[PDB]
PDB file of C-alpha atoms and ligand atoms in Angstrom:
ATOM      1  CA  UNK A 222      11.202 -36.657 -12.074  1.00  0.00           C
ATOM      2  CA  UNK A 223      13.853 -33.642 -12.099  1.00  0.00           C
ATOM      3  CA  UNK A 224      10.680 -31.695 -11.124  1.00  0.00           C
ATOM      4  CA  UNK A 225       8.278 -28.767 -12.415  1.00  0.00           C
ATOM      5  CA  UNK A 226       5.350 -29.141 -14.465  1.00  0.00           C
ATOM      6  CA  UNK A 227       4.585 -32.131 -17.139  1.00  0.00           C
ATOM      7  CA  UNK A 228       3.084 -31.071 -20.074  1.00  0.00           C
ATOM      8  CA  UNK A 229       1.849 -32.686 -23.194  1.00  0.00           C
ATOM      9  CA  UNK A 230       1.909 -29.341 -25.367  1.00  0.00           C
ATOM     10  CA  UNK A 231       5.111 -27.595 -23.458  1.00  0.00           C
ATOM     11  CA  UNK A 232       6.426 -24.380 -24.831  1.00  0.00           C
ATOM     12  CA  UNK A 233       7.217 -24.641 -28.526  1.00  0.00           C
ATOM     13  CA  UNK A 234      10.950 -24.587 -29.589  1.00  0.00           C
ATOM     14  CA  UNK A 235      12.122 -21.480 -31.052  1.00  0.00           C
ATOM     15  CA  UNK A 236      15.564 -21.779 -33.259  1.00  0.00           C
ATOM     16  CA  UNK A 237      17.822 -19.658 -34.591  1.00  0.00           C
ATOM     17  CA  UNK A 238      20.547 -19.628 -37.152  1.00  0.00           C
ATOM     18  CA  UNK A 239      22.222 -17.178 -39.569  1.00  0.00           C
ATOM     19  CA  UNK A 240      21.485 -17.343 -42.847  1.00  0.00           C
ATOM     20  CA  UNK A 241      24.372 -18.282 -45.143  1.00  0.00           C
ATOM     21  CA  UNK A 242      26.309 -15.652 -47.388  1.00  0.00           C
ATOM     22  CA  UNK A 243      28.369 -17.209 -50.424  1.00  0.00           C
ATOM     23  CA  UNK A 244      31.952 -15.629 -50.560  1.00  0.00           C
ATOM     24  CA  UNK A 245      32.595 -14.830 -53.835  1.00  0.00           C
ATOM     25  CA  UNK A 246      31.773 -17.632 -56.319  1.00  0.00           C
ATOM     26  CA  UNK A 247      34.208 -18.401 -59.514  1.00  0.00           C
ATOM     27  CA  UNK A 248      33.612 -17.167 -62.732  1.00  0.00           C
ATOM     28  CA  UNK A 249      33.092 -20.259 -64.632  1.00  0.00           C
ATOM     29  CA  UNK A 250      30.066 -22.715 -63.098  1.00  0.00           C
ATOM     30  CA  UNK A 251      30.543 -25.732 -61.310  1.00  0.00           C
ATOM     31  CA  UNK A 252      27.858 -27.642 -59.768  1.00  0.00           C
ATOM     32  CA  UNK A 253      29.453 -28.475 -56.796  1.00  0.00           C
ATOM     33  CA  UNK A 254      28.507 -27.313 -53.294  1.00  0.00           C
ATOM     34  CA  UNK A 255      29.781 -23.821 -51.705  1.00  0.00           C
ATOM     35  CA  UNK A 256      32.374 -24.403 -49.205  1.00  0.00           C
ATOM     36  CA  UNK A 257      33.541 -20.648 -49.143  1.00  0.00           C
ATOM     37  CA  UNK A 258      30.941 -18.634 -46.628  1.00  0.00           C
ATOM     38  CA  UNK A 259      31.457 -14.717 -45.072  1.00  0.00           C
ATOM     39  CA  UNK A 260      32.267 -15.564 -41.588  1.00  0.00           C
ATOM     40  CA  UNK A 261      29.473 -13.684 -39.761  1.00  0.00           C
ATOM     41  CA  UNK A 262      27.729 -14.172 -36.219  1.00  0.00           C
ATOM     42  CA  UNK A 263      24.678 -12.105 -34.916  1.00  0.00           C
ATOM     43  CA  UNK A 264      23.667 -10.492 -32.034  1.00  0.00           C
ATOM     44  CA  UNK A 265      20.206  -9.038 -30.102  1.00  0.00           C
ATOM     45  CA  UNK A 266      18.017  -9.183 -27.336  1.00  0.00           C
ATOM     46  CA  UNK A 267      15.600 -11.421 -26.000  1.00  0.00           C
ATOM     47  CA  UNK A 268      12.422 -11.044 -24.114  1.00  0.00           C
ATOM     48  CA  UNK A 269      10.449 -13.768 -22.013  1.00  0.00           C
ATOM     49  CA  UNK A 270       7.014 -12.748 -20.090  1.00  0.00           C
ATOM     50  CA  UNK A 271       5.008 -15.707 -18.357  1.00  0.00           C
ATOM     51  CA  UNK A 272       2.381 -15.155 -16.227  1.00  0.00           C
ATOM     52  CA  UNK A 273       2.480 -16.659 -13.258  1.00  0.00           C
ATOM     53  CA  UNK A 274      -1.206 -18.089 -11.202  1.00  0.00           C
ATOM     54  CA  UNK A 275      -0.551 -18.232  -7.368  1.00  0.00           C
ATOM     55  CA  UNK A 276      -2.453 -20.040  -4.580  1.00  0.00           C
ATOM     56  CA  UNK A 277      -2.345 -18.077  -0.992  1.00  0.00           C
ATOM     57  CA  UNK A 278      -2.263 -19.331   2.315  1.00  0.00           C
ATOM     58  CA  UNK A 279      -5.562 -19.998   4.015  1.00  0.00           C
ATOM     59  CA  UNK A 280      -3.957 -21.409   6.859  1.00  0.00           C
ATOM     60  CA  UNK A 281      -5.291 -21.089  10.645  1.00  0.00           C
ATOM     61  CA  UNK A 282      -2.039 -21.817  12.411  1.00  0.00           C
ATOM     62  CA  UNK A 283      -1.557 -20.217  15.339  1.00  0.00           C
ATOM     63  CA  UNK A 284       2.369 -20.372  15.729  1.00  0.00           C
ATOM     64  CA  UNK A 285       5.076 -18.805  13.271  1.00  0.00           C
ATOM     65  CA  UNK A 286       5.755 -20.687  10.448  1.00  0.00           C
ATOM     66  CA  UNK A 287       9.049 -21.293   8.974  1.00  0.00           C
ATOM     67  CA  UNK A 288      10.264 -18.585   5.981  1.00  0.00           C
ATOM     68  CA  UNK A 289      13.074 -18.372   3.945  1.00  0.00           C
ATOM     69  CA  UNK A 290      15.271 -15.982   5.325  1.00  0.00           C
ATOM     70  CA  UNK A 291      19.306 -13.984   4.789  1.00  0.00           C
ATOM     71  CA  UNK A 292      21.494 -14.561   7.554  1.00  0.00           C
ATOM     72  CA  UNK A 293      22.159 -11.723   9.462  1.00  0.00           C
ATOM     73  CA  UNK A 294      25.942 -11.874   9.906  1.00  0.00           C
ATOM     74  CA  UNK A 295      28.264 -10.282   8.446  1.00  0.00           C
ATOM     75  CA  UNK A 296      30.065 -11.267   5.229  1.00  0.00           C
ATOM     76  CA  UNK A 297      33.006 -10.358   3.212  1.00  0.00           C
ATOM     77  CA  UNK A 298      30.518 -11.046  -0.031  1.00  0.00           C
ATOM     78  CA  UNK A 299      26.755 -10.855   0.064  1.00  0.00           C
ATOM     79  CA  UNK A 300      24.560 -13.799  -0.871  1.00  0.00           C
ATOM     80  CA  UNK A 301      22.883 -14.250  -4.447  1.00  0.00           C
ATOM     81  CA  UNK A 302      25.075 -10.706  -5.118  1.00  0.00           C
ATOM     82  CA  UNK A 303      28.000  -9.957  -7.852  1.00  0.00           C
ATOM     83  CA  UNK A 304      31.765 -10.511  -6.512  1.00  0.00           C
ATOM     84  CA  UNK A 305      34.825  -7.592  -6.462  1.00  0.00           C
ATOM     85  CA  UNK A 306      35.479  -9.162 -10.028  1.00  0.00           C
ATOM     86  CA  UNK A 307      31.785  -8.999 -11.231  1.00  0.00           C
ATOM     87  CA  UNK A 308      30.828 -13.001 -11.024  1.00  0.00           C
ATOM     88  CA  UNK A 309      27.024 -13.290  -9.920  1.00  0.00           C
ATOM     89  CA  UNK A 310      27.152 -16.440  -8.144  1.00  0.00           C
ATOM     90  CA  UNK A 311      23.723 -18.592  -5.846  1.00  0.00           C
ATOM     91  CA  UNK A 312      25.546 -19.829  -2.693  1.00  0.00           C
ATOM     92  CA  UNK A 313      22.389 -22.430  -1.921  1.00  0.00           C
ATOM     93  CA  UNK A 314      19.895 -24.298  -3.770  1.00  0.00           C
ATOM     94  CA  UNK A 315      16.229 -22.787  -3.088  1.00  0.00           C
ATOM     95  CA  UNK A 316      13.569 -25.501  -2.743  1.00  0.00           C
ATOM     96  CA  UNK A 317       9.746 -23.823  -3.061  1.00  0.00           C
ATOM     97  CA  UNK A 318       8.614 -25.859   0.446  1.00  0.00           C
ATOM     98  CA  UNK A 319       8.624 -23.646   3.693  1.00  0.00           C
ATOM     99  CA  UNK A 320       4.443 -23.501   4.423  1.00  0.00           C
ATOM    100  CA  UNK A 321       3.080 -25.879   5.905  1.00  0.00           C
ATOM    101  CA  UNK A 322      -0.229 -27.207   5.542  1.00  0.00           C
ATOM    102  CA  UNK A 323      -1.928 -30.478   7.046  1.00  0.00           C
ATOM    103  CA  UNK A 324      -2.450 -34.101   5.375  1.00  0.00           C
TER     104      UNK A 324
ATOM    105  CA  UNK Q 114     -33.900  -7.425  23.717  1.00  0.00           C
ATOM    106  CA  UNK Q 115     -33.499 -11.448  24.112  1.00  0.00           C
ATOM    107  CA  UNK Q 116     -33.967 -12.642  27.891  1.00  0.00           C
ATOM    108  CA  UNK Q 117     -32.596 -15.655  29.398  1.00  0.00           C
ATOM    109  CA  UNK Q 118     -32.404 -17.773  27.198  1.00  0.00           C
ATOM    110  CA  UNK Q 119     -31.236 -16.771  24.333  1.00  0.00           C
ATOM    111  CA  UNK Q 120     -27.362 -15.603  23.443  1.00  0.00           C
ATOM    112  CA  UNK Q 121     -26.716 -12.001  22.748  1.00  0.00           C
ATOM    113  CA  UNK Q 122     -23.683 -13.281  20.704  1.00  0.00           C
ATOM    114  CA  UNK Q 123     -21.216 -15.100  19.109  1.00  0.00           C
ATOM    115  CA  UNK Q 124     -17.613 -15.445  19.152  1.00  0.00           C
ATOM    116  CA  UNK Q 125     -15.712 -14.219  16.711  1.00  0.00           C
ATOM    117  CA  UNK Q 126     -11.748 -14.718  16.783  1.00  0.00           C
ATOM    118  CA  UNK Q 127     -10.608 -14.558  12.897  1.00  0.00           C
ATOM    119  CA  UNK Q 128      -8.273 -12.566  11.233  1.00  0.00           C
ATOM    120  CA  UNK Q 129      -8.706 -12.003   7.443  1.00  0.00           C
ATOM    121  CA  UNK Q 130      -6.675 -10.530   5.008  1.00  0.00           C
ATOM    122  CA  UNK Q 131      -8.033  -8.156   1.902  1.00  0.00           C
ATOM    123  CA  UNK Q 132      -4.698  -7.548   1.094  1.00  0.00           C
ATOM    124  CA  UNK Q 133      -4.901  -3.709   0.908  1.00  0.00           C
ATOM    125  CA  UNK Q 134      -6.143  -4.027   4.380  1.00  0.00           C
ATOM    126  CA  UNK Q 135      -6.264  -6.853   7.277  1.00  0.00           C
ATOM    127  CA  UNK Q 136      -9.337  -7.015   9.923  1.00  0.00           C
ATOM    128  CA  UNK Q 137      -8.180  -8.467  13.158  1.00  0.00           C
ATOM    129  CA  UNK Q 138     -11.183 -10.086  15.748  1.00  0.00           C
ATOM    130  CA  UNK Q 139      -9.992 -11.034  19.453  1.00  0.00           C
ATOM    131  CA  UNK Q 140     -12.943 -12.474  21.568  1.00  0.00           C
ATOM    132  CA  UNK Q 141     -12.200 -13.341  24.817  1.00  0.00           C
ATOM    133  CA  UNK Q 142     -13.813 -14.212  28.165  1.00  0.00           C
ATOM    134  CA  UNK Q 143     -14.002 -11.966  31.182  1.00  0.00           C
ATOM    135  CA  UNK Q 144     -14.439 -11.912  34.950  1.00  0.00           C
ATOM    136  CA  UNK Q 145     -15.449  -8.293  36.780  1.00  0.00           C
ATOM    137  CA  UNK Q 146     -15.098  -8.318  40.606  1.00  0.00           C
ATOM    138  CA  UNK Q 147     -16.533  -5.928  43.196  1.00  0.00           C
ATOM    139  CA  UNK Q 148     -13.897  -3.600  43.784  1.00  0.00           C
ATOM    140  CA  UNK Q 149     -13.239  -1.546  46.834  1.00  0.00           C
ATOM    141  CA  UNK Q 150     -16.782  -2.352  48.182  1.00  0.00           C
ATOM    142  CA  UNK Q 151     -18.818   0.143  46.098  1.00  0.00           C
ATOM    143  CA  UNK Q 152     -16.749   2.379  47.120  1.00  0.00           C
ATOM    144  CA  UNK Q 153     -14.938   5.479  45.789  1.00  0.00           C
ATOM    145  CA  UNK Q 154     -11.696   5.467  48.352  1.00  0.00           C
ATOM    146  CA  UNK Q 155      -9.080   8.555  48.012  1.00  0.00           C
ATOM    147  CA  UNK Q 156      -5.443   7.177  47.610  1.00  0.00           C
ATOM    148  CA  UNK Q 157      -2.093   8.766  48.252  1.00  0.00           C
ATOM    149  CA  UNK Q 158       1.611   7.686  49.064  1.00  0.00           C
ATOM    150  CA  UNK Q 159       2.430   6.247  52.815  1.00  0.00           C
ATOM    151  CA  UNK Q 160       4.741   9.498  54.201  1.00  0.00           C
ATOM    152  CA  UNK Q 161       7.860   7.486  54.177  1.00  0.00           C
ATOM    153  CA  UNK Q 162       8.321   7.449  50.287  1.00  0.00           C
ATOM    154  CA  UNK Q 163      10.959   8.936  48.794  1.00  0.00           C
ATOM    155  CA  UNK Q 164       9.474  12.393  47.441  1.00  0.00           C
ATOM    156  CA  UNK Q 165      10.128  11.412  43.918  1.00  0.00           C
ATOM    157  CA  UNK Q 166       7.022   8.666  44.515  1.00  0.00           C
ATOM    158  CA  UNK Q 167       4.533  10.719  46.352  1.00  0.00           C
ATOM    159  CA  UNK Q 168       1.140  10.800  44.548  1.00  0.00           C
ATOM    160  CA  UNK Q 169      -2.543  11.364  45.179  1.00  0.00           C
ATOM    161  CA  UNK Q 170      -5.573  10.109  43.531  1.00  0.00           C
ATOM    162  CA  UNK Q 171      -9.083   7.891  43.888  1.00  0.00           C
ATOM    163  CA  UNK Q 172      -9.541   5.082  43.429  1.00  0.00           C
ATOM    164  CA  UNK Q 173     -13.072   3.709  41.632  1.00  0.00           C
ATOM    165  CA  UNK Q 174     -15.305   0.633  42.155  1.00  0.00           C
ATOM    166  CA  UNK Q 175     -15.149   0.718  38.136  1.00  0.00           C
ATOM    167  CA  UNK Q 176     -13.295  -1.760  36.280  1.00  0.00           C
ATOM    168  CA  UNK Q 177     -12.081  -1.189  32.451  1.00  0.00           C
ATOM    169  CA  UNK Q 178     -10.879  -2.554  29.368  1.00  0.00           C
ATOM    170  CA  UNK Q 179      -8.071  -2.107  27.485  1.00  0.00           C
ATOM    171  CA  UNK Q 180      -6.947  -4.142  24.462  1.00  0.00           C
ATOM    172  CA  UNK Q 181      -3.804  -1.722  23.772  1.00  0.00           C
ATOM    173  CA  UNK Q 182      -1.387  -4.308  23.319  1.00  0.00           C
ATOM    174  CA  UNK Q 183      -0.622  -5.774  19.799  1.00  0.00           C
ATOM    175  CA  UNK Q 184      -1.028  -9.595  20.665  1.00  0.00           C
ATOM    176  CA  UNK Q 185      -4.746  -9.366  21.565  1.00  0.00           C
ATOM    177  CA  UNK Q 186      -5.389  -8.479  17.936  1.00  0.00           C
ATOM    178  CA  UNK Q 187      -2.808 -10.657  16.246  1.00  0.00           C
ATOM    179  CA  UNK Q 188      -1.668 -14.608  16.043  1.00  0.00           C
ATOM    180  CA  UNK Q 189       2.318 -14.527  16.268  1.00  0.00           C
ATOM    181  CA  UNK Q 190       1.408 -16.410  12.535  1.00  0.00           C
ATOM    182  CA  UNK Q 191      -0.546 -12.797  11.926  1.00  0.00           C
ATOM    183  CA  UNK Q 192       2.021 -11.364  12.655  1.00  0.00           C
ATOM    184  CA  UNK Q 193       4.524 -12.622  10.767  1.00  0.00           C
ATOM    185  CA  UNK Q 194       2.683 -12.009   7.832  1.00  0.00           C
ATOM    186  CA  UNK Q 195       2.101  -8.291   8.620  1.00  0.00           C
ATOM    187  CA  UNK Q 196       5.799  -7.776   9.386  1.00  0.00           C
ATOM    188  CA  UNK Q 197       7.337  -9.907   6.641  1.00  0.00           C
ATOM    189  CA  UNK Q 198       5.580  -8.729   3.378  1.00  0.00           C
ATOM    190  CA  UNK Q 199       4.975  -4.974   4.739  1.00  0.00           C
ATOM    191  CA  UNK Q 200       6.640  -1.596   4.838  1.00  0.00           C
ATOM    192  CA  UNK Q 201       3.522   0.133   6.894  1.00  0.00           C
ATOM    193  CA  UNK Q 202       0.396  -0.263   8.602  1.00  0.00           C
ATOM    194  CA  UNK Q 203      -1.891   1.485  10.820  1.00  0.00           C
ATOM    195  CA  UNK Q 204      -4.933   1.340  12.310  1.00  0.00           C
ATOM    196  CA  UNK Q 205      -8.198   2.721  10.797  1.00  0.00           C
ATOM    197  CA  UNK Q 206     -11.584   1.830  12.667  1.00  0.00           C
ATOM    198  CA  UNK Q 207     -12.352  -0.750  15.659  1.00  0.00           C
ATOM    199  CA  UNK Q 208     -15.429  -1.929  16.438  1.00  0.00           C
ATOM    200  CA  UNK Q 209     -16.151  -3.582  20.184  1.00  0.00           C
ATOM    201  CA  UNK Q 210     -18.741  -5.607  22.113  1.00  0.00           C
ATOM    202  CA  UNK Q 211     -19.882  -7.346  25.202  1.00  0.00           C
ATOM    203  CA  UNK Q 212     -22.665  -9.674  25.459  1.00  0.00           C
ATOM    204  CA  UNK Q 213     -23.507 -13.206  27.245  1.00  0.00           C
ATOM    205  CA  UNK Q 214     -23.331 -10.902  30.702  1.00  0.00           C
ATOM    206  CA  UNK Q 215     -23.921 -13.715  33.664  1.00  0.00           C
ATOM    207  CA  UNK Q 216     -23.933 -12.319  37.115  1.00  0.00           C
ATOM    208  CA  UNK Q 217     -23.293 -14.780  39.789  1.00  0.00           C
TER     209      UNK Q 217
HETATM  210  N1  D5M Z 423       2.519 -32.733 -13.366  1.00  0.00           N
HETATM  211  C1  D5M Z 423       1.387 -33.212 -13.880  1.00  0.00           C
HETATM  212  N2  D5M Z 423       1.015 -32.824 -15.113  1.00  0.00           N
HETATM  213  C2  D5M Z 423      -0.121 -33.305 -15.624  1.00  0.00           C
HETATM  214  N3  D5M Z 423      -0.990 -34.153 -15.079  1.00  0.00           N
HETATM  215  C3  D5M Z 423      -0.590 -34.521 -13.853  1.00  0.00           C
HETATM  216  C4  D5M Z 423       0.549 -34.112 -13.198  1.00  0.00           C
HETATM  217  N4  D5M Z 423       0.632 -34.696 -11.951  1.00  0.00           N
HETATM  218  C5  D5M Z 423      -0.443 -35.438 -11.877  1.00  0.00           C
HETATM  219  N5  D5M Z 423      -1.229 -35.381 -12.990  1.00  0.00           N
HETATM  220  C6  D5M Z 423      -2.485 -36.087 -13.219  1.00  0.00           C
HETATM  221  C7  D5M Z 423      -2.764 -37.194 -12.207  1.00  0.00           C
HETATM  222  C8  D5M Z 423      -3.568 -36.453 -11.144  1.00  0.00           C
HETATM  223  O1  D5M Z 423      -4.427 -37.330 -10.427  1.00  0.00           O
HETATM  224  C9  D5M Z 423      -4.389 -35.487 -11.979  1.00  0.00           C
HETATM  225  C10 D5M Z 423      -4.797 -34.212 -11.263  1.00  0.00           C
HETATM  226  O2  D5M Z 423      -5.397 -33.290 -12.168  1.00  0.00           O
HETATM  227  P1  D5M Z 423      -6.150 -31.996 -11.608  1.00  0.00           P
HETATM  228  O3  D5M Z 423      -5.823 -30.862 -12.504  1.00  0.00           O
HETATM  229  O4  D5M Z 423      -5.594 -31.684 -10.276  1.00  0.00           O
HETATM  230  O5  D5M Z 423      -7.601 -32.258 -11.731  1.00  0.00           O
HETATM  231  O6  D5M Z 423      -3.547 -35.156 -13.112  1.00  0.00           O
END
């Protein structure tokens, strides 16, 4: 009800987390649990490739249908474009619906 | 080789799109009058004109057609497609016809 695509087997989870390292233990043994750790944090890339099926437009309609489209005008910033301070920011929500089609 | 009757064609308006290419049908209807009487009839500019718009030529009982504007071959929807998702086209081969003739 957000929206998108309902699926009984969706993407699987993937998790992450650094394994611990002990800072140094004591010399004699005790059986209680290691509270002492190497803070540590980790860092890397990540890669995500879907594949995408699309359905064209068979459409016979004879006048110009509506498209998603930049305004013209001029603007101190550019839309959907980095600021002077580096900020990426999307102005306007982008619904999928601008074809038309017939009941 | 049909005769009366029987249709020496059919109409074909669509456009389709291959996607490396797009093949653009107009058929339309047509009416040819008699020009000029049969005649072939010399024409020039009535002495009076400025001399910038003098000219001289014929005139023909011939008629012609000429499908050199864009919108015969496209929908303004066409269109729209070509000029939105394109950097380039041009044309490459045409292909042209005239049949049901009725004289009256
Ligand atoms: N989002 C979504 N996920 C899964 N199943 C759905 C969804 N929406 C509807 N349905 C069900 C109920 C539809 O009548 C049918 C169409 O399946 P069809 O593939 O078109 O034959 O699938």
């Amino acid at each position: 009800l957000m929206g998108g695509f309902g699926l009984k087997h969706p993407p699987p989870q993937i998790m992450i987390k650094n394994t611990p390292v002990p800072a140094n233990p004591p010399t004699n043994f005790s059986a209680a649990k290691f509270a002492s750790f190497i803070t540590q944090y980790s860092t890397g890339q990540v890669s995500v490739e879907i594949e995408w099926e699309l359905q064209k437009e068979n459409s016979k309609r004879w006048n110009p249908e509506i498209q998603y489209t930049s305004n013209y005008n001029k603007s101190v910033n550019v839309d959907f474009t980095v600021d002077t301070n580096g900020v990426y920011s999307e102005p306007r929500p982008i619904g999928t619906r601008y074809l038309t089609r017939n009941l | 080789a049909d005769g009366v009757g029987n249709s020496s064609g059919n109409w074909h308006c669509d456009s389709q799109w291959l996607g490396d290419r797009v093949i653009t049908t107009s058929t339309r209807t047509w009416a040819l009058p008699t020009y000029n009487n049969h005649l072939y009839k010399q024409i020039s500019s009535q002495s009076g004109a400025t001399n910038d718009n003098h000219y001289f030529g014929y005139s023909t009982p011939w008629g012609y057609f000429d499908f050199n504007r864009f919108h015969c071959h496209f929908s303004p929807r066409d269109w729209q497609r070509l000029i939105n998702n394109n950097w380039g086209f041009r044309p490459k081969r045409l292909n042209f016809k005239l049949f049901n003739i009725q004289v009256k």
